[PDB]
Amino acid sequence: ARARKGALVQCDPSIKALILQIDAKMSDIVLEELDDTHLLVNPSKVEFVKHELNRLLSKNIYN
DNA sequence: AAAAAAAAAAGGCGCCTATAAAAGGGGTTTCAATGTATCTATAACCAGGCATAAGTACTAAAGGGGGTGGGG
């Protein structure tokens, strides 16, 4: 009966957890948790999330 | 004392030895060199047992440099 625009993000559970951590810090990122591997995210924040994930993973001093 | 059987002995018969010289054939009996199965000393064969040399992996060591994380 209702539709809303957004960006669907499909990712592994560990990445889902990381995006939730990003949201908790920055807010206004995650619109809905959909399932263990899917989120609805603010479309204007998708590139931010992708860049931040890359930084979190690639720049980790314990790599 | 007698008849009887068993025994040793004799006499006789036959053939042997050494003598002799000289013409053709067939017999059995013993001994010659040349070979199978079995023997001998030799040479050569396997498997099994002990000692020495070569190769193994193993543990064994010490010496250092570089990168990442934590603390000041």
UniProtKB/Swiss-Prot annotation:
One of its GO terms (cellular component) is transcription factor TFIIH core complex. GO terms for biological process: nucleotide-excision repair; nucleotide-excision repair, preincision complex assembly; transcription by RNA polymerase II; transcription initiation at RNA polymerase II promoter. InterPro entries: TFB5-like_sf, TFIIH_TTDA/Tfb5. Gene3D superfamilies: TFB5-like. It comes from the Eukaryota. Component of the 7-subunit TFIIH core complex composed of XPB/SSL2, XPD/RAD3, SSL1, TFB1, TFB2, TFB4 and TFB5, which is active in NER. The core complex associates with the 3-subunit CTD-kinase module TFIIK composed of CCL1, KIN28 and TFB3 to form the 10-subunit holoenzyme (holo-TFIIH) active in transcription. An additionnal subunit, TFB6, plays a role in the dissociation of the SSL2 helicase from TFIIH after transcription initiation. Interacts with TFB2. Belongs to the TFB5 family. Component of the general transcription and DNA repair factor IIH (TFIIH) core complex, which is involved in general and transcription-coupled nucleotide excision repair (NER) of damaged DNA and, when complexed to TFIIK, in RNA transcription by RNA polymerase II. In NER, TFIIH acts by opening DNA around the lesion to allow the excision of the damaged oligonucleotide and its replacement by a new DNA fragment. In transcription, TFIIH has an essential role in transcription initiation. This is General transcription and DNA repair factor IIH subunit TFB5. It comes from Saccharomyces cerevisiae (strain ATCC 204508 / S288c).
